[model samples]
Target chain A: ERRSMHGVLVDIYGLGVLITGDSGVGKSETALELVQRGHRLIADDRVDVYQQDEQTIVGAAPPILSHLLEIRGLGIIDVMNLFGAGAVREDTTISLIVHLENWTPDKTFDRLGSGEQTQLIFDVPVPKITVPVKVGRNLAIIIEVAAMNFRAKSMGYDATKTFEKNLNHLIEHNEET
Target chain B: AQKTFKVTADSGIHARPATVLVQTASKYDADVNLEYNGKTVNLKSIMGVMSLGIAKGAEITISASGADENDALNALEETMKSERLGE
Candidate 1:
């Protein structure tokens, strides 16, 4: 069956990450923050998404949500007018998936990114990254880094192992010296 | 003035790979506009788009004016008809 669909695509410090999770998980807040941090917000709460190819997913917003933000208490704010034209983007190619979760101490989460999660939207298999939410953790910052780090990994630069290896190597070198 | 579209895509509203919609709408003349929920916007503006992370069957409105209104509508229509990223 030839099925078709649409959604939003975004780039975080050059990392194309897709934001997905239940409502009130602070998706909009995080997106707002990302834009505040010089990253562009592709779509808000409801993204207009679609599949561009076997490995790429693109995203945009519906007419309604465009330029508006669903701020829980304060209500919707027009981001483009408020933040200027630079803070927003028409669409993007999603490279990573960051699913937000509200903090629940009892819920065991994946800290190692060892496992993968998949959502079938538009028949494209996008790589997934599950993000755990908590009170102390700022999901927006974390998710932004997740996207950035993921980009680095795709380029063969694993910061996690790289730091570990460099640290270990430095220790050994000191001992030898 | 411009036109806006609702979240008719099966995925509803979520930022996966919907950037195409925003990008497509940008490639036109006239002041393309979009509105969702209670919000209204210029379709060509990216920030005006982030507001509506629309979902399947969600309602949206599109507005257009100026010289390239027809072209903008045609392009936006084609964008809506195409499927996007995510598997």
Candidate 2:
């Protein structure tokens, strides 16, 4: 473990999920939901994330923000003491980045992460996934599936490409349209 | 009414923090204002609160003026005392 200005290191199911976005875009809330569902909470508000190697970025809560959350109107509170061990994560590798943003009628948001998204920190390539915010959108659920699906892809399961290939074949077979 | 708290921890009031503070202060009927870095900023505006950047081991005083002024400040004072900034 190459420790560089790091407090601790953690693992996340062989895949890293970095929940990021503008303030109040629901990143923390989504992470809270994921944590409640047994996914870990690597960091709450400020994550001290450092890339360990290719396909690996380690993250942890800032010492001053570890296991603590600031819910609007609720103030800063301890997550482990309030929610339990299941609600907080220590440290983990950030493999996939889930970025949250408010929805706009004019701007087209990618339903599938087919766009080229990359974020580099400390000279490491991190795959970025942009998630648009909207009413009735279960962001936590969607982001969880995204991380899982990304894991599948990293492990050689490209569902989107598979579908694309099948569609291409079908169009070729038609030979008229 | 007025109430004060010691920072006790490091890394001053950033974005989420001001939001949390503002949100908690909203529970009462009084208008809340926080004193930090010699400036009295609205305890309600999330943006204004974050710009203060009151770092570690500082003191903050919260005041409210209205029907719930005392209740608000005292409540927030208790909140300030209970703040555990991670780690």
Candidate 3:
């Protein structure tokens, strides 16, 4: 099934990460920052999402949305023109989704991702995570790590699982006393 | 193999150079890790390497272990010096 999503899609380390958030949450700015950091941008403002296969999903920009990124104050900038050809891709298979939110005192952050969060797209479930927007935080770097870390998990390396294993080991060692 | 360098860049290992460093480190098959203070992080990881906040005059110890360790060390050292990453 085909679906349209309001988000910024960037390719980080060959992984498609769709960045979604409410207006003025710095989605485009974060995409620009990611472009500057040697990543490629697939779409901005809106993304055309679809299920390519039973287990695969893809994302691309519409004709009117391609290569154009709108910054709140700076206006629209051509990503391909500014960042060169390598900075833009026609489409990508999206394996992860990230939602950005303005930081609030009462908001809870994911310290340990024990719950597997998933976002349903066209009846296909894609892994999703949330990032809190805050001053002085490097969103591009954080998002980059999120993509790479997600890839690492698919390859059988899970940081949270490793932490749990270490915690269990420590507890058992302490019980011997 | 290991190399010690005193960071000379004004902003430390901030974004730009860290990107270059990570790119360089990832090209090799060797296991690359950067040591600063006491904590060590994978050199190929952009976030892990950048999170160190390595300021100027901060000593960095880089270790590489694998088949291409020597080549990785030399290339990384050359990049750090040529790019003025640590001076």
Docking class of 2: incorrect
Worst ten in a row by lDDT for model 3 chain A: A168-177
Docking class of 3: incorrect
Off by over 4 Å in 3: B1-87
Model 2, span A1-177: residue lDDT tens? 322221112223556577665555755556666666776665564455556666566777546566765565665567688678876667777677777778898877776556678977677777877878889999878887887788788788988888888989999999986
lDDT (10s digit) by residue, model 3, range B40-62: 99998866876676666678999
Task: Name the candidate that leads on TM-score.
Answer: 3
Q: For residues A100-142, could you state the per-residue lDDT of candidate 3 as single tens digits?
A: 9988755655655555899888777999999899999888889
TM-score of chain A of each: 0.80, 0.84, 0.95
Complex DockQ, candidate 3:
0.02
Model 2 lDDT per residue over B1-87, tens place: 787766655677666565578778868767777776565655754434554567777777788899988888777766665675321
* lDDT (Cα) of model 3: 0.84
Which candidate should be chosen as best, given lDDT against the real structure?
A: 3
Q: Candidate 2: where are CA atoms >4 Å away?
A: A1-14, B1-87
Question: Measured against the native two-chain assembly using Cα atoms, what DockQ does each of the candidate structures obtain, in the order listed?
Answer: 0.07, 0.05, 0.02
Ranking by TM-score: 3, 2, 1
Query: Each candidate's TM vs. the true structure?
Result: 0.58, 0.63, 0.66
Stretches of candidate 1 exceeding 4 Å from the true structure: A1-9, A160-177, B1-87
Give residue A62's error in model 2 in angstroms.
1.9
TM-score: model 1, chain A: 0.80
Q: Which candidate leads in DockQ?
A: 1
